Design an enzyme around this catalytic site. Structure first.
Site, PDB file in Angstrom:
ATOM      1  N   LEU A 191       0.820  -1.208   0.000  1.00 44.50           N
ATOM      2  CA  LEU A 191       0.000   0.000   0.000  1.00 44.50           C
ATOM      3  C   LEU A 191       0.855   1.260   0.000  1.00 44.50           C
ATOM      4  O   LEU A 191       0.388   2.334  -0.374  1.00 44.50           O
ATOM      5  CB  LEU A 191      -0.940   0.014   1.207  1.00 44.50           C
ATOM      6  CG  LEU A 191      -2.087  -0.998   1.207  1.00 44.50           C
ATOM      7  CD1 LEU A 191      -2.847  -0.938   2.519  1.00 44.50           C
ATOM      8  CD2 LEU A 191      -3.025  -0.751   0.034  1.00 44.50           C
ATOM      9  N   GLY A 192       2.106   1.125   0.422  1.00 50.41           N
ATOM     10  CA  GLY A 192       3.013   2.255   0.468  1.00 50.41           C
ATOM     11  C   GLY A 192       4.190   2.024   1.394  1.00 50.41           C
ATOM     12  O   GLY A 192       4.281   0.992   2.060  1.00 50.41           O
ATOM     13  N   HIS A 193       5.097   2.994   1.439  1.00 44.49           N
ATOM     14  CA  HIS A 193       6.286   2.884   2.271  1.00 44.49           C
ATOM     15  C   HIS A 193       6.298   3.952   3.359  1.00 44.49           C
ATOM     16  O   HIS A 193       5.688   5.012   3.213  1.00 44.49           O
ATOM     17  CB  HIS A 193       7.549   2.987   1.412  1.00 44.49           C
ATOM     18  CG  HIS A 193       7.657   1.921   0.366  1.00 44.49           C
ATOM     19  ND1 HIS A 193       6.791   1.835  -0.703  1.00 44.49           N
ATOM     20  CD2 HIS A 193       8.526   0.892   0.229  1.00 44.49           C
ATOM     21  CE1 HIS A 193       7.123   0.801  -1.454  1.00 44.49           C
ATOM     22  NE2 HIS A 193       8.173   0.212  -0.911  1.00 44.49           N
ATOM     23  N   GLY A 194       6.990   3.662   4.455  1.00 47.89           N
ATOM     24  CA  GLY A 194       7.114   4.606   5.547  1.00 47.89           C
ATOM     25  C   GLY A 194       8.552   5.042   5.745  1.00 47.89           C
ATOM     26  O   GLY A 194       9.356   5.002   4.815  1.00 47.89           O
ATOM     27  N   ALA A 195       8.876   5.456   6.964  1.00 44.99           N
ATOM     28  CA  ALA A 195      10.223   5.910   7.279  1.00 44.99           C
ATOM     29  C   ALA A 195      11.093   4.766   7.790  1.00 44.99           C
ATOM     30  O   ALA A 195      10.665   3.977   8.634  1.00 44.99           O
ATOM     31  CB  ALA A 195      10.175   7.035   8.304  1.00 44.99           C
ATOM     32  N   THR A 236      10.034   0.700   7.016  1.00 46.09           N
ATOM     33  CA  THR A 236       8.679   0.247   7.307  1.00 46.09           C
ATOM     34  C   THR A 236       7.833   0.217   6.038  1.00 46.09           C
ATOM     35  O   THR A 236       7.798   1.182   5.277  1.00 46.09           O
ATOM     36  CB  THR A 236       7.990   1.134   8.362  1.00 46.09           C
ATOM     37  OG1 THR A 236       7.838   2.461   7.849  1.00 46.09           O
ATOM     38  CG2 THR A 236       8.811   1.176   9.643  1.00 46.09           C
ATOM     39  N   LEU A 288      -8.067  -0.142   7.366  1.00 45.69           N
ATOM     40  CA  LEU A 288      -7.704   0.048   5.970  1.00 45.69           C
ATOM     41  C   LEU A 288      -8.445   1.247   5.384  1.00 45.69           C
ATOM     42  O   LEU A 288      -9.674   1.251   5.308  1.00 45.69           O
ATOM     43  CB  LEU A 288      -8.012  -1.215   5.166  1.00 45.69           C
ATOM     44  CG  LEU A 288      -7.841  -1.128   3.650  1.00 45.69           C
ATOM     45  CD1 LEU A 288      -6.390  -0.893   3.297  1.00 45.69           C
ATOM     46  CD2 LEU A 288      -8.361  -2.389   2.981  1.00 45.69           C
ATOM     47  N   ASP A 306       3.684  15.725  13.588  1.00 48.37           N
ATOM     48  CA  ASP A 306       3.957  15.401  12.188  1.00 48.37           C
ATOM     49  C   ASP A 306       2.688  15.408  11.338  1.00 48.37           C
ATOM     50  O   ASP A 306       2.564  14.647  10.379  1.00 48.37           O
ATOM     51  CB  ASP A 306       4.657  14.041  12.090  1.00 48.37           C
ATOM     52  CG  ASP A 306       5.351  13.833  10.755  1.00 48.37           C
ATOM     53  OD1 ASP A 306       5.622  14.835  10.058  1.00 48.37           O
ATOM     54  OD2 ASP A 306       5.630  12.665  10.406  1.00 48.37           O
ATOM     55  N   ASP A 352      -0.627   7.797  11.775  1.00 49.88           N
ATOM     56  CA  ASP A 352       0.830   7.906  11.857  1.00 49.88           C
ATOM     57  C   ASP A 352       1.286   8.501  13.189  1.00 49.88           C
ATOM     58  O   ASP A 352       1.700   9.660  13.249  1.00 49.88           O
ATOM     59  CB  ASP A 352       1.364   8.746  10.690  1.00 49.88           C
ATOM     60  CG  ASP A 352       2.855   8.571  10.474  1.00 49.88           C
ATOM     61  OD1 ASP A 352       3.376   7.471  10.757  1.00 49.88           O
ATOM     62  OD2 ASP A 352       3.506   9.536  10.012  1.00 49.88           O
TER      63      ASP A 352
END
Lengths: 404, 405
Positions: free
Chosen positions: B18-22, B25, B85, B129, B152
């Site tokens: 679904l995507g990338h984090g920092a 992750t 989700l 953030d 987040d």
């Protein structure tokens, strides 16, 4: 020396029994993902009602007044259901003396319960087992606030696509004494619908504000009376403004004719839930609406129909003497007219700041004391005016007061 | 030909990223107890932010506009966080041309986001953030409606007991372009507080209603301008009612001084969120309030102070002709007075039904077109009145319009 049972992510101590219930279904205080939960142990035979409940809970537990469902686990001999841990049931809220309301007042509890119920109905889910034991009181949040939640979905039914009704094909679900009459009536042509919940809710409503009574009598005679239609709301005094408005809603909710029962969202619009400020605003709105209306018009004629009982023959004789003295400077306000009582209320509300100190004293502050000054003296005024002004319910001005 | 990973109650397909984090992750689409969820996979080095996020989510997720948390599983190699989700981020809601609102107006989105934020602050939690990328758009419910949510929480700051601020010793957690100036100031004696979120929220506010712009320019020099104080709200036209109210709130939210910024609950009471009906009710309420007020009194003097620009010198010459005709006899209404403009409004509102068809036609129906008749011709009327009538904010009548700390 106490013992612990662990089934997957669900764990509990067998000594911490919270209560029994249905088919020997035991509820333990338990743990899941490091939070305190309630754990329902389900017998192998009730894997049907558990698989039903668990699924329906997934779809509707996001609402704040529907019990939060966490997880379920399968054992060698049992099924376990983890749900939010609660402080008590509504029965304890009502029947335990000196119960910590913690900001949760009876009408707000009823409003919350109806909200949760409306949510289920919007998802085409009928509860079919609404009762004081199924309505839970939450644990206090971080701000010390508590709320009411609907639970026990084992008997709930998801209505088929395209249907607004269901059949009693799966027998008659529910607990004796809170069941809608059309569920048991053998001659009943009309299939039961969402309104079976409304009927039960009605009984719960009366049960709360009467502090323990039931509209259809005592434990054993309740369901018999329900089919008979022998209800009694005599805890609601006919000369008390609050009881009057309460009776008007409740007797509709527990009406014998299912189609006459108001939907959950309709219920939420009833004066029963209006604040004192909204009540006065309604009084002001109707007054301005009928100011230029002719005395022979359908509106005013509807408003004065049965008006003498409302004004208690002469409303100028049933108010305090500093207000009588302030009103003798007008005298166009006829004491036999409901319309003129409403005109005088609106006039004194509008010019309130300019009024002498001693008449502001008997009226009390705006808007709470002011509106109660009249409703307490004319306990049928709100109900009567609300009913009569239904003729204007489609007008934009009166939209927030009625249901569409 | 697809693979499945099962960790406890949490399962997901590695292909559904679904995507990338920092810092390594990754977020997959997955399943938890037959619920469609999002799954954060976290590296051992980031277990710190994980257990923090988990804890705070195990406290504040009891709010419709804060992301829902379900479960956490720990592996031999990774951690797994199961959360609700969602369908999209705010960035995709705004920047993707022709994005289906699905009944979600921009302002309601901002109301929902702020409510979620207010909830966090009430629990003594600072997000630090907040940004379009972690403001999430929910999956459509059964009725096809969507909502906004805050997510987040890995960089969130649980304030210590008895503290209303925190030190910068961890550094600069926020994302460049959305960071409050006091977080990048070498001088500031004052520790940062909840208002660092308010600053970011203000930037988001303008980001949404401008459909993609930022109060401090394009991404390359946003944070640079933030420190300079070079704000610019060009998309908000100076003579449009909606934009005047929007500007008034946003300028306070992204104020350089942290103490000047309104709290999240304060933000929620702002006219920016008022329905058309509530706007008219406010006009009526101050009109009834100043009817028997002395013309030399503090209230009326404040209300007329700067009135010339508000009523455009003479409001009788800036209304429609059928209304001019109907108000001509009312010589008691002075054309250069703000109070009297409000009086004419309240009067025509009260007697609206009795009014001739021609004047009802130019006014429009009550209450929507009616209030817009005046706010569109006098774009500063509401903003001016609201600020001036703050003298009566402590009174019972005007409590729902203002905020009280």
């Amino acid at each position: 020396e106490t013992s612990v049972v662990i089934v997957g992510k669900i764990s509990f101590c067998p000594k911490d029994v919270l209560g029994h219930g249905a088919e020997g279904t035991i509820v333990y205080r338990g743990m899941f993902d490091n939070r305190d939960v309630a754990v329902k142990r389900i017998l192998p035979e009730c894997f049907s009602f558990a698989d039903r409940e668990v699924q329906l809970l997934r779809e509707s537990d996001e609402h704040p007044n529907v019990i939060r469902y966490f997880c379920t686990e399968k054992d060698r001999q049992f099924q376990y259901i983890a749900i939010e841990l609660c402080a008590a049931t509504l029965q304890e809220y009502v029947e335990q003396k000196d119960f910590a309301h913690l900001g949760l007042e009876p009408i707000t509890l009823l409003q919350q319960t109806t909200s949760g119920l409306a949510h289920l109905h919007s998802l085409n889910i009928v509860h079919r087992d609404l009762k004081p034991h199924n309505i839970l009181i939450s644990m206090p949040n971080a701000h010390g606030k508590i709320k009411a939640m609907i639970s026990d979905f084992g008997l709930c039914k998801k209505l088929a696509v395209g249907r607004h009704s269901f059949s009693r094909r799966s027998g008659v679900p529910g607990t004796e004494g809170w069941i809608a009459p059309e569920m048991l009536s053998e001659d009943c042509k009309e299939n039961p619908t969402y309104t079976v919940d409304i009927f039960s809710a009605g009984c719960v409503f009366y049960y709360v504000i009467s502090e323990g009574s039931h509209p259809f009598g005592k434990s054993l005679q309740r369901q018999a009376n329900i089919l008979l239609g022998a209800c009694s709301l005599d805890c609601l005094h006919p000369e008390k403004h609050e009881d009057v408005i309460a009776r008007e809603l409740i007797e509709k909710m527990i009406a014998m004719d299912p189609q006459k029962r108001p939907s959950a969202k309709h219920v939420l619009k009833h004066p029963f839930f209006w604040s004192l400020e909204k009540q006065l605003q309604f009084f002001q709105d109707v007054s301005d609406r009928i100011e230029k209306e002719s005395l022979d018009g359908p509106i005013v004629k509807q408003l004065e129909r049965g008006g003498r009982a409302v004004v208690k023959m002469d409303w100028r004789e049933n108010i305090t003497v500093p207000l009588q003295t302030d009103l003798r400077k007008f005298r166009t306000y006829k004491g036999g007219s409901v319309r003129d009582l409403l005109r005088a209320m609106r006039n004194k509300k509008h010019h309130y700041r300019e009024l002498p100190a001693e008449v502001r004293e008997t009226l009390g502050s705006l808007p709470d004391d002011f509106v109660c000054y009249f409703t307490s003296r004319f306990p049928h005024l709100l109900a009567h005016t609300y009913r009569a002004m239904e003729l204007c319910s489609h007008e934009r001005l009166f939209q927030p007061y009625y249901f569409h």
